[PDB]
Ligand binder design. Structure first.
Ligand code: NAI
Ligand code: NAI
Ligand code: NAI
Ligand code: NAI
Ligand code: SFX
Ligand code: SFX
Lengths: 334, 333, 333, 333
């Protein structure tokens, strides 16, 4: 007999087991592995599946993770260029494609990553018809729209990682000013994950105290405390970090892990993420951008209606315009 | 014009949710709440259901937990005398029934808790036919047997918390001896969760160093390290705690959470838990007692075969005879 | 020639080291043990010390926790009626004294519990001159004032658990009404942890959306929603739970641990807790009541100044007057 | 008045605070950042400090982590090429230096990395004279010797990550073969973190069942289950992963965090880490290699005396000689 047979006496019939909280990460570059190690660190998946077109690095990442297995709570890790290995995922994180060169706008990536997504979105849905797709690749709003169209999935099951990260950055910068933890700072960056984002100044608050009531000039050009510069640091953050170390990955990895935690624990927590906002704030096309949404096990099930101020609605409309201007030229999507 | 309608714009239609990791704790006493609170503390459930016969205390425990929701990760906590609230439970923990008085053996409770289990076990399976059942009430070995029989579930879905806790206690006393963390001490108490439990001296080791190898008289009357008294402390521990504070609950609630974690995260980790050991070590009947078992999302799917020494095998058989003497006379199971 | 001596070769010479994260809990009742298990399950202490007047209960509780050690990350669990066991604690949580009977106001617990504190507090300060004290016993506001006075510690090191719990409950009720997690609902209950607490309607908000903007009648009697009813449920919660199960413990246990976590990890997070509010909002004496405060490793280092509406300031003055009426007549402090 | 002066009212005076649990990571490469994120994900440090000679990369890594601050529990993240930033670190991880090329042996990296450490280690002890140093850069056993000599620290505060990773790899492969979780398989890979590591077959056990009792040919060349091939996979794993992805980093980050947790929580758990083994198993010189060691807040305070088999003592003495043969010719330490 094998050692296994000497040691192990079966009590159950052997059986094909169906993973419950299977997560797939697509693309195992900087962002993909940031997301993967964050997912594994929070024990969010009982099965992790990696997909990339670079087979050698894909197998290497899978082996490195598997070696850390003693320290994790994920009994199965699997990797393949073939999407069969992503079968029955609850959530598929898509991180594949080109990124920004230094100084380069995410919008300049569209045409390349669109061609990438046309190949990978169908495959996801072939093997995980019931999954939630979290889109990360840039430009994230456009490609969330593109994934929704390409997948034929319900709007609530195709989420763009959107401004979660921008908002996190916002709240850290405010936190650094006030000397309090970021989670005790409340503020929402909305719209495009990019240059046209919108700082909802009217919502920024500590312990229910409106900071715009303490500082009516907050977010104007004439503001002795210059909070416009905080929104600007938020807008420029990606470019500065890309200039310094060539990419960003740890922050987005943590943010994606936060979204996943809200969905798999069925928490119904509110996250600023990218969704179709046709018919709100006067936007008239099928634009995707970040609004506050309720995330739980079903995916994105609600948007929060806000009492945006005039200049804030105007910024949001301009961001919607910038995005639709690129969306309207996107063909061959079904 | 409701504030919820003003505030929330729906994206998906509202649908009826079935929970993924629903756990039910039956009995909301010292042990039941210790279990519920350990379960919530580790975010093991997306839905906790409490069941008891005391409707007032039940709703009170439920409300106190819900008041804690801000600090938890469990969106739905519910409670009811009616087992319909437990439907679709992935795991059901049974803690309901009578407990030991001071000095009282756990076997003394069989008659009463059989009558208890004969009512609740059916109710459980009636509403969650695919669940795993973790028996905690005493005597837990005999009651896991009773539960297996009444439920009609496969033996891999009926689990008795067993000696997980005895072994935790053993490992604590070991680490106290040695100045190491309990998780770096290894040693298994097996057999009855009670006075007939067996210390597997041949398995006791620190970092793969057999301590019986550095002491062939480990566990005997002529033992300079006096390990026998450690096994006696493990055996007497419940009674001592019961005398000092009337009951035990914290360690067992942590134990049961450990088991649930291994099963919900599907780790196939090995725990000394109570299972049907017919055909092992010369035991000829469907005795339930604790052995090392592999636990995962299907439940208790394998037992580990061990090369027990003769004396260990003999204590194990004696423990099986103790239990089977009670089991063989139970009726209408 | 002992087992330890043969198994372990020393690399460092034996020294007595001081714990880095010692927490003491005073009182091992329902609340003290809910606190202990919450602290242990979050691995917030490297040494936990339990103190009570009931020596047997105390030993029993300590033994139960130690028997759970395998599942925990606290290598030292110690218990004694002598406060020498609490020496060098970073945080001391006081949960000792009488609690409310059915329907009893917390302010009716004053004299009894003041006497208790007069003995407990000096002992704490003798053995942990540098600790932060978290007062939990009721009335928590008046007793936080008492502890400040008895101890001689600075204001930033005497913290009343206060309305953290009240707000928790508020946020839970809110979440039930809106169908979101309590953490994504924001709203502040301030003032006394008791009947005169103040719902800060003007701060209530989801995702930065002022709920009193979508509903300016919020908190009045002309309200289509029943928000005042939410605040009333908050006020009555403790009585309702005391009536169903005789006491409350799980939610306050999680609240105390939430505060300890902000402190020990130095996060400077904002919690509504009881501090000395003389000179704010027109309050004229050294009243202790809950405001939103920045907590971290030094303790309670800032209060948040808020733009309370006139009715809110008025309710807060009414709270502070209820409390000061009791305080002013307190002697031998 | 500033917005912050309006918002925040001081309760305590301003004061400079010392981090309680500061960790510095030296080198922000693949491995350094893998360690960094592993430490942050476990909320192991209240202050994280990064050091590297690449100023731009250094600042960028720092900025990324800060932008993740909302999802974390480390309130202060600093970085600089100046070691002033590392002042008062409790633990300093050293990951800086050259790494293996494809197929290259770690020993071939000594010269270059000695020149690294001759600069780095004196800086470290300059600002944290009391710290523990975890050496990760390769060759890790040799560089741990170098760090010990250069730092003038006591042995219990210079720890090489050693075979913690090798054993992790060992256990994973073993779990893969048995269908159980790696934590329920026990097995020690000792000696050099390199081609001369020793597999301690006599300790390999599941639930205390010695697997070399069921397979007495385990470890030999005449073993139909080819356990020696498992040890081979452990020795080759780093080369295979380097050939596939260019380096390894995640598994060692997790291993390092596991060590840090044992020490900062004062758990006294046992890890296979590199210590100075002179006078052990016939080793005559100040060689560093991995044995099972107790780790707690003081550092590496104990080694576990093992009853190795003759062949295993042999492979360990070969490892020692392989190492000392390089160690002995190093200058200016
Ligand atoms: N939403 C956000 O906040 C952020 C978005 N991003 C975006 O994330 C995406 C990736 O960034 P990095 O991880 O640093 O790039 P990376 O180059 O370091 O890794 C990208 C991965 O995509 C893989 N890939 C390309 N086409 C593929 C296909 N058809 N199938 C499978 N794999 C494919 C490449 O092999 C590579 O391994 C980029 O678009 C970047 O702009 C980056 C950071 C934050
Ligand atoms: N396996 C182990 O390691 C341990 C086992 N136990 C056992 O666990 C059990 C619970 O002990 P405690 O929480 O201290 O007793 P407890 O009195 O504090 O609570 C038991 C609960 O069971 C409830 N209950 C009784 N009959 C019921 C019925 N027919 N249906 C529904 N609920 C019913 C009672 O109302 C009570 O609320 C006892 O059997 C005790 O012996 C306790 C400690 C250790
Ligand atoms: N602030 C809050 O949100 C809440 C506060 N509380 C308060 O917490 C306190 C404890 O309530 P419970 O734990 O349910 O009562 P509990 O009756 O279960 O007893 C707590 C312990 O107080 C101990 N004690 C009395 N004098 C002592 C002394 N001099 N030294 C050490 N221990 C002493 C008793 O022996 C008892 O063990 C009460 O004052 C209650 O009002 C309760 C719930 C919430
Ligand atoms: N013990 C173990 O199991 C393992 C050890 N290692 C070792 O980790 C070390 C680093 O590996 P990687 O992160 O992949 O290489 P890396 O090439 O990605 O980054 C190494 C960092 O060291 C920095 N550095 C070089 N000299 C420095 C100095 N004097 N001060 C500060 N920073 C300096 C470089 O700037 C680089 O940024 C290597 O020696 C490698 O062998 C690698 C894997 C596991
Ligand atoms: C895991 N599936 C089998 C579980 C159990 O089957 C068994 C029936 C008898 C025995 C026996 F006889 F003790 F060996 C052992 C097992 C059973 C019995 C009745 C209904 C379902 C399962
Ligand atoms: C950081 N907290 C400041 C220290 C505090 O000092 C006081 C501050 C204010 C007052 C009061 F209330 F104005 F009288 C009284 C004392 C104090 C109180 C008692 C003992 C020591 C310090």
């Amino acid at each position: 007999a094998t050692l296994k047979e000497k040691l192990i006496a079966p009590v159950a019939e052997e059986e094909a087991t169906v993973p419950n909280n299977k997560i797939t990460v697509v693309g195992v570059g900087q962002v993909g592995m940031a997301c993967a190690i964050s997912i594994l660190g929070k024990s969010l998946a009982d099965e992790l599946a990696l997909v990339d077109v670079l087979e050698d690095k894909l197998k290497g990442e899978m082996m490195d993770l598997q070696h850390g297995s003693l320290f994790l709570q994920t009994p199965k890790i699997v990797a393949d260029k073939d999407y069969s290995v992503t079968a029955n995922s609850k959530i598929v994180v898509v991180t594949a494609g080109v990124r920004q060169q230094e100084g380069e706008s995410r919008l300049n990536l569209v045409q390349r990553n669109v061609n990438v997504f046309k190949f990978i979105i169908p495959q996801i849905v072939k093997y995980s018809p019931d999954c939630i797709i979290i889109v990360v690749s840039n430009p994230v709003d456009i490609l969330t729209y593109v994934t929704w169209k390409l997948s034929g999935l319900p709007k609530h099951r195709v989420i763009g990682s959107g401004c979660n990260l921008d908002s996190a950055r916002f709240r850290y910068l405010m936190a650094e000013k006030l000397g309090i933890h970021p989670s005790s700072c409340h503020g929402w960056i909305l719209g495009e994950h990019g240059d046209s984002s919108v700082a909802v100044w009217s919502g920024v608050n500590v312990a229910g105290v409106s900071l715009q009531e303490l500082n009516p000039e907050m977010g104007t050009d004439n503001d002795s405390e210059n909070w416009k510069e905080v929104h600007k640091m938020v807008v420029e953050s990606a470019y500065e970090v890309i200039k310094l170390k060539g990419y960003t990955n740890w922050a987005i990895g943590l943010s994606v892990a936060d979204l996943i935690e809200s969905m798999l624990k069925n928490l119904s927590r509110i996250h600023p993420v990218s969704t179709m906002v046709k018919g709100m704030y006067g936007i008239e096309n099928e634009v995707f951008l970040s609004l506050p949404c309720i995330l739980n096990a079903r995916g994105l099930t609600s948007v929060i209606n806000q009492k945006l101020k005039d200049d804030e609605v105007a910024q949001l409309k301009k961001s919607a315009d910038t995005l639709w201007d690129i969306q309207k030229d996107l063909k061959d999507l079904e």
